[PDB]
Amino acid sequence: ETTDGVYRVMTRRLLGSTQVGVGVMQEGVFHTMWHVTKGAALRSGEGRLDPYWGDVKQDLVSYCGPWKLDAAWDGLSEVQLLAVPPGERAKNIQTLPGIFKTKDGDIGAVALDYPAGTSGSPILDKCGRVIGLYGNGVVIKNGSYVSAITQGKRE
Amino acid sequence: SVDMYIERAGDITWEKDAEVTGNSPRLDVALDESGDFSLVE
Ligand SMILES: N=C(N)N[C@@H]1CCCCNC(=O)[C@H](Cc2cccc(CN)c2)NC(=O)[C@H](CCCCN)NC(=O)Cc2cccc(c2)CNC(=O)CNC1=O
């Protein structure tokens, strides 16, 4: 129920399902963006995953244990979004990040535009390590999208 | 209540010889205490 990999986050009531996001299972912990689950518990098969750590400002939440993803964008190299869009199989998109310049420093950012339910898809370095999650971003003047490469702290 | 659940969707693997794309924008942004980014204009 916690096998390593990328997962869709789905909701259903009485009718069909909706994909609200995506996340990463690593080292027994499930990692997604806070806005996907709002910190609610997750079903995994017959099991229940409870939120362990989260932070609204970083827009991140981990389940079953503390945040495990610690790889960082090197500030130089191309990256891959492993996009898991609603209704489509996972696909890798390579890009050279831009930069969100903030008063607290620079954050890598990817100019790649996918449906809202792609939120939580992992962004990878060339070793396949997850350097952050896709889906907290901004809309620029022409209506296109730029996502921060959002990474947590592994304590 | 709403059934929020997960389902496996793949292995996490860098793809060699991948489609490379998108630009590299240099944006001035602010981050508020609700986790929302906005453009500084
Ligand atoms: N608008 C374009 N071109 N592309 C986006 C791509 C979305 C990728 C996944 N991320 C999200 O859904 C988050 C949710 C979200 C929303 C609010 C707060 C948080 C948590 N801090 C998270 N979202 C975003 O970051 C952005 C910027 C957020 C700025 C702070 N509030 N929010 C939007 O894009 C809204 C939007 C604006 C204009 C048109 C459309 C949607 C219509 N597009 C779609 O209906 C599918 N595409 C789209 O929605």
* Residue A79 CB-density burial (10 A; 0-12 exposed, 13-18 middle, 19+ buried): buried
Whether the CA torsion A121, A126, A132, A137 is positive or negative: it is negative
Q: Which residues pair with A92 in a beta bridge?
A: A82
- CA distance linking residue B9 with residue A7, whole number of Å: 5
Nearest CA to ligand 1 atom 11: A116
A35 lines ligand 1 (CB under 6 A): yes
Tokens 């990878």 correspond to: A124
Euclidean distance between CA atoms B17 and A96, whole angstroms: 15
Evaluate whether B21 touches A94 at the Cβ level (below 8 Å).
yes
Is residue A119 within 8 Å of residue A135, measured between CB atoms?
A: yes
Domain boundaries, chain A: 1-69, 70-155
Specify the residue for token string 């910190």: A39
Q: Cα–Cα distance between A47 and B3 in angstroms, integer?
A: 12
For residues A16 and A32, the answer to whether their CB atoms sit within 8 Å is no
For residue A16, the chain B residue with the least C-alpha distance is B3
User: Taking CB atoms and an 8 Å cutoff, what residues of chain A touch B25?
Assistant: 98-99, 109, 111, 140, 146
Q: How far apart are CA B34 and CA A81, in angstroms?
A: 25
Q: Which of B13, B19, B38 comes nearest A128 by C-beta?
A: B13
Are A42 and B6 in contact by the 8 Å Cβ rule? The answer is yes
* Backbone dihedral angles phi then psi of residue A35, each to the nearest 5 degrees: -70, -15
Residue A44 forms beta bridges with which residues? A47
CA distance A38 to chain B (A): 11
Q: Which two tokens stand for residue B20?
A: 């490379």
- The three state secondary structure string of chain A is CCCCEEEEEEEECCCCEEEEEEEEEECCEEEEEHHHHCCCCEEECCEEECEEEEECCCCEEEECCCCCCCCCCCCCCCEEEEECCCCCCCEEEEECCEEEEECCEEEEEECCCCCHHHCCCEEECCCCCEEEECCCEEECCCCCEEEECECCCCC
Strands of the sheet containing A47-49, edge to edge, are A47-49, A42-44, B3-10, A5-12, A17-26, A29-33, A60-63, A51-55
Quickly tell me which residue has 């496996």 as its tokens: B8
Distance CA B28, CA B40 (A): 5
CA-angle at A52, arms to A70 and A9, nearest 5°: 80
C-alpha closest to that of A50 among B25, B9, B4, B15: B4
Q: Which residues pair with B28 in a beta bridge?
A: A101
Distance A116 CA to ligand 1 centre (A): 6
Q: Which is it for strands A98-102 and B26-31: parallel, antiparallel or unpaired?
A: parallel
Dist CA A60 CA A23 (whole Å)? 10
Instruction: Give the angle subtended at the CA of A109 by the CAs of A104 and A112, to the nearest 5°.
Output: 155
Contact A44, A16 (CB under 8 A): no
Quoted resolution (Å): 1.4
Pairing verdict, β A79-83 and A122-124: antiparallel
* Cβ atoms of A134 and A112 closer than 8 Å: yes
Q: Residues 1 to 41 of B: which have CB under 8 A from any A CB?
A: 2-15, 18-35, 37-39
